[PDB]
Design an enzyme around this catalytic site. Structure first.
Site, PDB file in Angstrom:
ATOM      1  N   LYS A 142      43.495  24.128 -13.113  1.00  0.00           N
ATOM      2  CA  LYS A 142      44.080  25.349 -13.658  1.00  0.00           C
ATOM      3  C   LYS A 142      44.660  25.049 -15.029  1.00  0.00           C
ATOM      4  CE  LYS A 142      48.274  24.619 -10.884  1.00  0.00           C
ATOM      5  NZ  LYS A 142      49.120  25.168  -9.832  1.00  0.00           N
ATOM      6  N   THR A 179      45.711  26.253  -5.618  1.00  0.00           N
ATOM      7  CA  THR A 179      46.438  27.389  -6.119  1.00  0.00           C
ATOM      8  C   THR A 179      45.617  28.649  -5.839  1.00  0.00           C
ATOM      9  OG1 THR A 179      47.432  26.003  -7.862  1.00  0.00           O
ATOM     10  CG2 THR A 179      47.370  28.428  -8.249  1.00  0.00           C
ATOM     11  N   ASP A 226      47.690  15.666 -13.255  1.00  0.00           N
ATOM     12  CA  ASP A 226      48.252  15.821 -11.919  1.00  0.00           C
ATOM     13  C   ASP A 226      47.219  15.503 -10.846  1.00  0.00           C
ATOM     14  OD1 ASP A 226      50.761  16.912 -12.888  1.00  0.00           O
ATOM     15  OD2 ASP A 226      49.569  18.656 -13.455  1.00  0.00           O
ATOM     16  N   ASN A 271      47.588  22.716 -15.448  1.00  0.00           N
ATOM     17  CA  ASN A 271      47.385  21.287 -15.212  1.00  0.00           C
ATOM     18  C   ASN A 271      46.496  20.636 -16.277  1.00  0.00           C
ATOM     19  OD1 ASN A 271      49.023  21.532 -12.998  1.00  0.00           O
ATOM     20  ND2 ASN A 271      47.390  21.360 -11.436  1.00  0.00           N
ATOM     21  N   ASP A 279      42.971  20.766  -7.946  1.00  0.00           N
ATOM     22  CA  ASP A 279      44.047  21.593  -8.525  1.00  0.00           C
ATOM     23  C   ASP A 279      43.800  21.896  -9.992  1.00  0.00           C
ATOM     24  OD1 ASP A 279      46.233  23.270  -8.281  1.00  0.00           O
ATOM     25  OD2 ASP A 279      47.703  21.677  -8.514  1.00  0.00           O
TER      26      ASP A 279
HETATM   27  O1  LIG Z   1      53.345  18.694 -18.822  1.00  0.00           O
HETATM   28  S1  LIG Z   1      53.920  17.920 -17.778  1.00  0.00           S
HETATM   29  O2  LIG Z   1      55.342  17.889 -17.626  1.00  0.00           O
HETATM   30  C1  LIG Z   1      53.310  16.279 -17.960  1.00  0.00           C
HETATM   31  C2  LIG Z   1      52.928  15.611 -16.828  1.00  0.00           C
HETATM   32  C3  LIG Z   1      52.385  14.343 -16.907  1.00  0.00           C
HETATM   33  C4  LIG Z   1      52.176  13.753 -18.128  1.00  0.00           C
HETATM   34  C5  LIG Z   1      52.560  14.405 -19.325  1.00  0.00           C
HETATM   35  C6  LIG Z   1      52.379  13.844 -20.610  1.00  0.00           C
HETATM   36  N1  LIG Z   1      52.776  14.416 -21.737  1.00  0.00           N
HETATM   37  C7  LIG Z   1      53.405  15.601 -21.644  1.00  0.00           C
HETATM   38  C8  LIG Z   1      53.623  16.262 -20.466  1.00  0.00           C
HETATM   39  C9  LIG Z   1      53.177  15.680 -19.254  1.00  0.00           C
HETATM   40  N2  LIG Z   1      53.297  18.480 -16.370  1.00  0.00           N
HETATM   41  C10 LIG Z   1      54.021  18.373 -15.087  1.00  0.00           C
HETATM   42  C11 LIG Z   1      53.351  19.128 -13.941  1.00  0.00           C
HETATM   43  C12 LIG Z   1      52.748  20.448 -14.347  1.00  0.00           C
HETATM   44  N3  LIG Z   1      51.329  20.330 -14.777  1.00  0.00           N
HETATM   45  C13 LIG Z   1      51.205  19.845 -16.158  1.00  0.00           C
HETATM   46  C14 LIG Z   1      51.819  18.473 -16.328  1.00  0.00           C
END
Ligand SMILES: O=S(=O)(c1cccc2cnccc12)N1CCCNCC1
Lengths: 18, 338
Positions: free
Chosen positions: B156, B189, B172, B159, B154
Protein backbone atom coordinates in the site's frame (compact mmCIF):
# COMPACT_ATOMS: atom_id res chain seq x y z
CA UNK A 1 -18.65 11.48 -8.46
CA UNK A 2 -16.44 8.49 -7.55
CA UNK A 3 -13.95 10.95 -5.97
CA UNK A 4 -16.79 12.46 -3.95
CA UNK A 5 -17.72 8.94 -2.82
CA UNK A 6 -14.07 8.32 -1.84
CA UNK A 7 -13.96 11.44 0.32
CA UNK A 8 -17.25 10.50 1.97
CA UNK A 9 -15.98 6.99 2.80
CA UNK A 10 -13.85 8.29 5.65
CA UNK A 11 -11.02 6.09 4.42
CA UNK A 12 -8.77 8.75 2.87
CA UNK A 13 -6.28 8.81 5.76
CA UNK A 14 -3.55 6.27 6.47
CA UNK A 15 -5.16 2.82 6.63
CA UNK A 16 -4.28 0.30 9.36
CA UNK A 17 -3.74 -3.39 8.76
CA UNK A 18 -6.51 -5.63 10.09
CA UNK B 1 18.79 -12.54 -20.89
CA UNK B 2 16.51 -15.13 -19.28
CA UNK B 3 19.60 -17.06 -18.18
CA UNK B 4 20.93 -13.88 -16.56
CA UNK B 5 17.80 -13.57 -14.41
CA UNK B 6 17.98 -17.26 -13.48
CA UNK B 7 21.64 -16.98 -12.44
CA UNK B 8 21.07 -13.68 -10.62
CA UNK B 9 18.20 -15.06 -8.55
CA UNK B 10 20.10 -18.25 -7.65
CA UNK B 11 23.03 -16.22 -6.33
CA UNK B 12 20.63 -13.99 -4.42
CA UNK B 13 18.95 -17.03 -2.86
CA UNK B 14 22.32 -18.39 -1.69
CA UNK B 15 23.19 -15.07 -0.07
CA UNK B 16 19.74 -14.76 1.55
CA UNK B 17 19.76 -18.29 2.99
CA UNK B 18 23.20 -17.78 4.53
CA UNK B 19 21.99 -14.69 6.44
CA UNK B 20 18.59 -16.29 7.14
CA UNK B 21 20.23 -19.27 8.84
CA UNK B 22 22.74 -17.24 10.88
CA UNK B 23 21.10 -13.87 11.57
CA UNK B 24 23.11 -10.92 12.91
CA UNK B 25 22.43 -9.82 16.46
CA UNK B 26 23.41 -7.00 18.79
CA UNK B 27 25.36 -4.74 16.44
CA UNK B 28 24.96 -1.37 18.24
CA UNK B 29 23.48 0.06 21.45
CA UNK B 30 21.11 2.89 22.34
CA UNK B 31 23.67 5.41 23.61
CA UNK B 32 25.50 5.32 20.26
CA UNK B 33 22.63 7.52 18.97
CA UNK B 34 20.97 10.88 19.60
CA UNK B 35 17.22 10.97 19.05
CA UNK B 36 16.07 13.77 16.74
CA UNK B 37 12.38 13.43 15.81
CA UNK B 38 9.56 10.89 15.62
CA UNK B 39 8.89 10.01 11.98
CA UNK B 40 5.99 7.57 12.46
CA UNK B 41 4.00 5.82 15.21
CA UNK B 42 1.89 2.69 15.58
CA UNK B 43 6.01 1.17 18.35
CA UNK B 44 7.66 4.25 16.83
CA UNK B 45 10.18 5.16 14.14
CA UNK B 46 12.59 7.95 15.00
CA UNK B 47 15.18 9.91 13.14
CA UNK B 48 18.43 9.40 15.04
CA UNK B 49 22.02 10.60 14.59
CA UNK B 50 24.89 8.20 15.11
CA UNK B 51 27.12 10.09 17.56
CA UNK B 52 30.50 8.86 16.28
CA UNK B 53 29.87 9.39 12.57
CA UNK B 54 27.09 11.98 12.38
CA UNK B 55 25.17 9.65 10.07
CA UNK B 56 21.37 9.81 10.26
CA UNK B 57 19.21 6.66 10.46
CA UNK B 58 15.59 5.68 11.03
CA UNK B 59 15.29 3.70 14.26
CA UNK B 60 12.23 1.51 14.75
CA UNK B 61 11.60 1.00 18.48
CA UNK B 62 9.31 -1.79 19.70
CA UNK B 63 8.12 -2.09 23.30
CA UNK B 64 8.54 -5.79 24.15
CA UNK B 65 5.60 -5.82 26.58
CA UNK B 66 3.37 -4.19 23.99
CA UNK B 67 4.47 -6.69 21.32
CA UNK B 68 3.59 -9.58 23.64
CA UNK B 69 0.21 -8.01 24.55
CA UNK B 70 -0.72 -7.51 20.90
CA UNK B 71 0.36 -11.11 20.06
CA UNK B 72 3.10 -9.89 17.69
CA UNK B 73 6.11 -11.90 18.90
CA UNK B 74 6.50 -14.07 15.82
CA UNK B 75 5.78 -11.20 13.42
CA UNK B 76 8.40 -9.01 15.11
CA UNK B 77 11.10 -11.66 15.14
CA UNK B 78 10.26 -12.51 11.54
CA UNK B 79 10.44 -8.90 10.32
CA UNK B 80 13.92 -8.47 11.75
CA UNK B 81 15.06 -11.84 10.41
CA UNK B 82 13.85 -10.94 6.93
CA UNK B 83 15.36 -7.46 6.93
CA UNK B 84 18.82 -8.59 8.01
CA UNK B 85 18.78 -11.24 5.24
CA UNK B 86 17.42 -9.53 2.11
CA UNK B 87 19.40 -7.37 -0.31
CA UNK B 88 17.70 -5.55 -3.20
CA UNK B 89 17.76 -1.94 -4.48
CA UNK B 90 14.14 -1.21 -3.47
CA UNK B 91 14.23 -2.81 -0.02
CA UNK B 92 15.27 -0.66 2.93
CA UNK B 93 18.64 -1.61 4.39
CA UNK B 94 19.03 -2.69 8.02
CA UNK B 95 22.20 -1.15 9.42
CA UNK B 96 22.05 -2.25 13.09
CA UNK B 97 19.79 -4.05 15.55
CA UNK B 98 19.88 -4.59 19.33
CA UNK B 99 17.59 -4.92 22.32
CA UNK B 100 17.57 -3.82 25.93
CA UNK B 101 15.51 -4.43 29.04
CA UNK B 102 12.40 -2.76 27.57
CA UNK B 103 12.67 -2.46 23.78
CA UNK B 104 13.75 -3.92 20.46
CA UNK B 105 15.61 -1.66 18.02
CA UNK B 106 16.08 -1.84 14.26
CA UNK B 107 18.24 0.93 12.81
CA UNK B 108 17.60 1.36 9.08
CA UNK B 109 18.80 3.69 6.42
CA UNK B 110 16.90 6.97 6.61
CA UNK B 111 14.69 7.42 3.53
CA UNK B 112 14.06 11.18 3.51
CA UNK B 113 11.40 11.58 0.87
CA UNK B 114 8.41 10.42 2.90
CA UNK B 115 5.64 7.89 2.28
CA UNK B 116 4.19 7.59 -1.20
CA UNK B 117 0.84 8.02 0.60
CA UNK B 118 1.53 11.69 1.44
CA UNK B 119 2.62 12.58 -2.08
CA UNK B 120 -0.33 10.80 -3.66
CA UNK B 121 -2.92 12.45 -1.42
CA UNK B 122 -1.28 15.87 -1.92
CA UNK B 123 -1.02 15.69 -5.72
CA UNK B 124 -4.28 13.72 -6.06
CA UNK B 125 -3.14 11.14 -8.59
CA UNK B 126 -0.12 10.21 -10.65
CA UNK B 127 0.01 10.24 -14.45
CA UNK B 128 0.39 6.76 -16.02
CA UNK B 129 4.17 7.17 -16.66
CA UNK B 130 4.71 8.30 -13.07
CA UNK B 131 2.65 5.36 -11.80
CA UNK B 132 4.40 2.96 -14.19
CA UNK B 133 7.79 4.03 -12.82
CA UNK B 134 6.80 2.99 -9.31
CA UNK B 135 4.92 -0.09 -10.53
CA UNK B 136 8.02 -1.43 -12.33
CA UNK B 137 9.97 -1.27 -9.08
CA UNK B 138 7.28 -3.25 -7.24
CA UNK B 139 7.21 -5.87 -10.01
CA UNK B 140 10.96 -6.39 -9.69
CA UNK B 141 10.78 -6.36 -5.89
CA UNK B 142 8.07 -9.02 -5.88
CA UNK B 143 9.99 -11.11 -8.42
CA UNK B 144 12.92 -11.03 -5.95
CA UNK B 145 10.83 -11.67 -2.84
CA UNK B 146 8.81 -14.48 -4.44
CA UNK B 147 12.00 -16.19 -5.66
CA UNK B 148 12.92 -16.41 -1.95
CA UNK B 149 9.46 -17.88 -1.17
CA UNK B 150 8.50 -14.65 0.64
CA UNK B 151 4.87 -13.48 0.33
CA UNK B 152 4.74 -9.78 1.18
CA UNK B 153 1.04 -9.21 1.95
CA UNK B 154 1.00 -5.52 3.01
CA UNK B 155 1.50 -3.50 -0.17
CA UNK B 156 0.00 0.00 0.00
CA UNK B 157 1.18 3.60 -0.51
CA UNK B 158 1.54 3.89 3.31
CA UNK B 159 4.27 1.21 3.18
CA UNK B 160 6.29 2.66 0.27
CA UNK B 161 8.94 5.29 0.93
CA UNK B 162 10.53 7.61 -1.65
CA UNK B 163 14.29 8.07 -1.54
CA UNK B 164 16.49 11.03 -2.46
CA UNK B 165 16.70 9.88 -6.10
CA UNK B 166 12.92 9.41 -6.29
CA UNK B 167 13.05 5.60 -6.15
CA UNK B 168 10.94 3.40 -3.89
CA UNK B 169 12.02 1.75 -0.66
CA UNK B 170 9.84 -1.00 0.88
CA UNK B 171 10.22 -1.02 4.72
CA UNK B 172 7.62 -3.10 6.60
CA UNK B 173 7.89 -6.88 6.73
CA UNK B 174 5.74 -7.59 9.79
CA UNK B 175 3.18 -9.58 7.78
CA UNK B 176 5.58 -11.17 5.30
CA UNK B 177 5.76 -14.98 5.42
CA UNK B 178 8.43 -17.29 4.03
CA UNK B 179 6.37 -20.25 2.70
CA UNK B 180 6.79 -22.24 -0.50
CA UNK B 181 3.12 -23.08 -1.04
CA UNK B 182 -0.16 -21.95 0.48
CA UNK B 183 -1.00 -20.23 3.75
CA UNK B 184 -4.18 -19.20 5.54
CA UNK B 185 -3.83 -16.12 7.76
CA UNK B 186 -6.34 -13.30 7.45
CA UNK B 187 -3.95 -10.35 7.28
CA UNK B 188 -3.37 -7.19 5.28
CA UNK B 189 -5.29 -3.98 4.77
CA UNK B 190 -8.94 -4.12 3.63
CA UNK B 191 -8.62 -2.15 0.38
CA UNK B 192 -5.68 -4.36 -0.69
CA UNK B 193 -6.97 -7.83 0.34
CA UNK B 194 -7.18 -10.38 -2.44
CA UNK B 195 -10.57 -12.12 -2.65
CA UNK B 196 -9.16 -15.54 -1.72
CA UNK B 197 -7.93 -14.07 1.58
CA UNK B 198 -11.37 -12.56 2.32
CA UNK B 199 -12.99 -15.89 1.47
CA UNK B 200 -10.90 -17.84 3.99
CA UNK B 201 -9.36 -19.99 1.29
CA UNK B 202 -5.79 -21.13 1.21
CA UNK B 203 -3.77 -18.67 -0.84
CA UNK B 204 -0.31 -18.20 -2.27
CA UNK B 205 1.99 -15.48 -3.57
CA UNK B 206 -0.62 -14.53 -6.20
CA UNK B 207 -2.18 -12.31 -3.54
CA UNK B 208 0.75 -9.91 -4.00
CA UNK B 209 -0.03 -9.56 -7.70
CA UNK B 210 -3.64 -8.74 -6.88
CA UNK B 211 -2.38 -6.07 -4.47
CA UNK B 212 -0.11 -4.69 -7.19
CA UNK B 213 -3.25 -4.14 -9.26
CA UNK B 214 -4.92 -2.28 -6.39
CA UNK B 215 -1.77 -0.14 -6.01
CA UNK B 216 -1.51 0.69 -9.69
CA UNK B 217 -5.20 1.61 -9.75
CA UNK B 218 -4.90 3.84 -6.68
CA UNK B 219 -1.75 5.59 -7.99
CA UNK B 220 -3.37 6.30 -11.38
CA UNK B 221 -6.87 7.17 -10.07
CA UNK B 222 -6.13 8.80 -6.71
CA UNK B 223 -8.46 6.32 -4.96
CA UNK B 224 -8.45 2.51 -4.79
CA UNK B 225 -10.73 0.27 -6.86
CA UNK B 226 -12.82 -0.94 -3.88
CA UNK B 227 -13.82 1.36 -1.04
CA UNK B 228 -16.75 1.88 1.31
CA UNK B 229 -17.56 3.24 4.75
CA UNK B 230 -16.86 -0.12 6.42
CA UNK B 231 -14.43 -2.97 5.69
CA UNK B 232 -17.20 -5.60 5.39
CA UNK B 233 -18.69 -3.52 2.54
CA UNK B 234 -15.24 -3.24 0.94
CA UNK B 235 -14.92 -7.04 1.09
CA UNK B 236 -18.26 -7.51 -0.72
CA UNK B 237 -17.08 -5.36 -3.65
CA UNK B 238 -13.69 -7.08 -3.80
CA UNK B 239 -15.19 -10.56 -4.14
CA UNK B 240 -17.96 -9.44 -6.52
CA UNK B 241 -15.76 -9.62 -9.60
CA UNK B 242 -16.85 -6.11 -10.71
CA UNK B 243 -14.64 -3.03 -11.00
CA UNK B 244 -15.01 0.36 -12.66
CA UNK B 245 -12.27 2.50 -14.17
CA UNK B 246 -11.90 6.30 -14.45
CA UNK B 247 -12.48 7.47 -18.02
CA UNK B 248 -8.88 8.79 -18.27
CA UNK B 249 -7.37 5.31 -17.77
CA UNK B 250 -5.76 4.16 -21.00
CA UNK B 251 -6.86 0.96 -22.74
CA UNK B 252 -3.53 -0.74 -21.96
CA UNK B 253 -3.88 0.17 -18.29
CA UNK B 254 -7.40 -1.21 -18.02
CA UNK B 255 -6.38 -4.48 -19.66
CA UNK B 256 -3.45 -4.93 -17.27
CA UNK B 257 -5.70 -4.16 -14.30
CA UNK B 258 -8.39 -6.59 -15.45
CA UNK B 259 -5.68 -9.29 -15.45
CA UNK B 260 -4.20 -8.40 -12.06
CA UNK B 261 -7.55 -7.68 -10.37
CA UNK B 262 -8.64 -11.14 -11.56
CA UNK B 263 -10.85 -12.85 -8.98
CA UNK B 264 -10.02 -16.28 -10.45
CA UNK B 265 -6.53 -16.77 -9.04
CA UNK B 266 -5.93 -19.44 -11.70
CA UNK B 267 -6.32 -16.76 -14.44
CA UNK B 268 -4.51 -13.91 -12.66
CA UNK B 269 -1.40 -12.35 -14.17
CA UNK B 270 1.72 -13.28 -12.27
CA UNK B 271 0.18 -16.65 -11.34
CA UNK B 272 0.16 -18.27 -14.82
CA UNK B 273 2.68 -20.49 -16.60
CA UNK B 274 4.95 -17.59 -17.57
CA UNK B 275 4.77 -16.08 -14.07
CA UNK B 276 6.04 -12.54 -13.80
CA UNK B 277 6.85 -12.21 -17.50
CA UNK B 278 3.16 -11.91 -18.38
CA UNK B 279 3.30 -8.64 -16.44
CA UNK B 280 6.70 -7.43 -17.69
CA UNK B 281 5.71 -8.12 -21.30
CA UNK B 282 2.29 -6.44 -21.06
CA UNK B 283 1.63 -3.54 -23.42
CA UNK B 284 1.38 -1.01 -20.58
CA UNK B 285 5.02 -1.77 -19.70
CA UNK B 286 6.25 -1.72 -23.31
CA UNK B 287 8.35 1.41 -22.70
CA UNK B 288 9.84 0.07 -19.46
CA UNK B 289 13.57 -0.69 -19.54
CA UNK B 290 13.53 -3.27 -16.76
CA UNK B 291 17.31 -3.49 -16.43
CA UNK B 292 17.65 0.30 -16.29
CA UNK B 293 15.00 0.46 -13.55
CA UNK B 294 16.85 -2.19 -11.52
CA UNK B 295 20.15 -0.32 -12.07
CA UNK B 296 18.46 2.96 -11.03
CA UNK B 297 19.49 4.65 -14.28
CA UNK B 298 16.00 5.91 -15.23
CA UNK B 299 15.28 9.55 -14.45
CA UNK B 300 12.67 9.64 -11.77
CA UNK B 301 9.49 11.63 -12.56
CA UNK B 302 9.40 13.21 -9.09
CA UNK B 303 12.20 14.13 -6.68
CA UNK B 304 11.15 15.06 -3.12
CA UNK B 305 12.41 18.25 -1.51
CA UNK B 306 15.59 17.57 0.48
CA UNK B 307 17.50 20.25 2.41
CA UNK B 308 20.26 17.98 3.66
CA UNK B 309 21.06 15.26 6.18
CA UNK B 310 18.41 15.25 8.89
CA UNK B 311 15.71 17.07 6.90
CA UNK B 312 12.34 15.64 8.05
CA UNK B 313 10.03 17.95 6.09
CA UNK B 314 8.49 15.10 4.05
CA UNK B 315 7.21 13.46 7.26
CA UNK B 316 4.40 14.57 9.52
CA UNK B 317 4.62 15.64 13.15
CA UNK B 318 3.96 13.34 16.11
CA UNK B 319 3.93 13.85 19.88
CA UNK B 320 7.41 13.14 21.26
CA UNK B 321 7.50 10.55 24.08
CA UNK B 322 10.38 9.35 26.26
CA UNK B 323 12.34 6.26 25.30
CA UNK B 324 12.21 4.61 28.71
CA UNK B 325 14.39 1.66 29.64
CA UNK B 326 13.30 -0.32 32.68
CA UNK B 327 15.63 -1.50 35.46
CA UNK B 328 14.01 -4.94 35.02
CA UNK B 329 14.43 -7.11 31.93
CA UNK B 330 11.07 -7.66 30.24
CA UNK B 331 10.16 -10.66 28.08
CA UNK B 332 13.70 -11.95 27.73
CA UNK B 333 12.82 -15.54 26.85
CA UNK B 334 10.35 -14.45 24.16
CA UNK B 335 12.92 -12.36 22.29
CA UNK B 336 16.11 -14.42 22.70
CA UNK B 337 16.61 -14.71 18.94
CA UNK B 338 16.34 -10.97 18.26
O1 LIG C 1 8.13 5.89 7.49
S1 LIG C 1 8.33 5.04 8.61
O2 LIG C 1 8.27 5.59 9.93
C1 LIG C 1 9.89 4.25 8.38
C2 LIG C 1 9.97 2.91 8.67
C3 LIG C 1 11.14 2.22 8.46
C4 LIG C 1 12.23 2.84 7.90
C5 LIG C 1 12.19 4.22 7.58
C6 LIG C 1 13.28 4.92 7.01
N1 LIG C 1 13.27 6.22 6.75
C7 LIG C 1 12.17 6.91 7.07
C8 LIG C 1 11.04 6.36 7.60
C9 LIG C 1 11.01 4.96 7.85
N2 LIG C 1 7.20 3.86 8.53
C10 LIG C 1 6.70 3.16 9.73
C11 LIG C 1 5.52 2.23 9.45
C12 LIG C 1 4.54 2.78 8.44
N3 LIG C 1 4.86 2.39 7.05
C13 LIG C 1 5.92 3.22 6.47
C14 LIG C 1 7.21 3.11 7.25
Amino acid sequence: TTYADFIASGRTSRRDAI
Amino acid sequence: EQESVKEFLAKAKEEFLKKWESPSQNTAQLDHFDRIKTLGTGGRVMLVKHKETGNHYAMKILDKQKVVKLKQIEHTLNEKRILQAVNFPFLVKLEFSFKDNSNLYMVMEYVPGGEMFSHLRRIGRFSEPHARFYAAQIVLTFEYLHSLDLIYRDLKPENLLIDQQGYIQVTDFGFAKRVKGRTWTLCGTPEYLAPEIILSKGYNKAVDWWALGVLIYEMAAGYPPFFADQPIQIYEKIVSGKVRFPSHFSSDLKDLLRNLLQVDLTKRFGNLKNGVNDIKNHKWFATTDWIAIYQRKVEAPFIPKFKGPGDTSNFDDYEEEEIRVSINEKCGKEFTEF
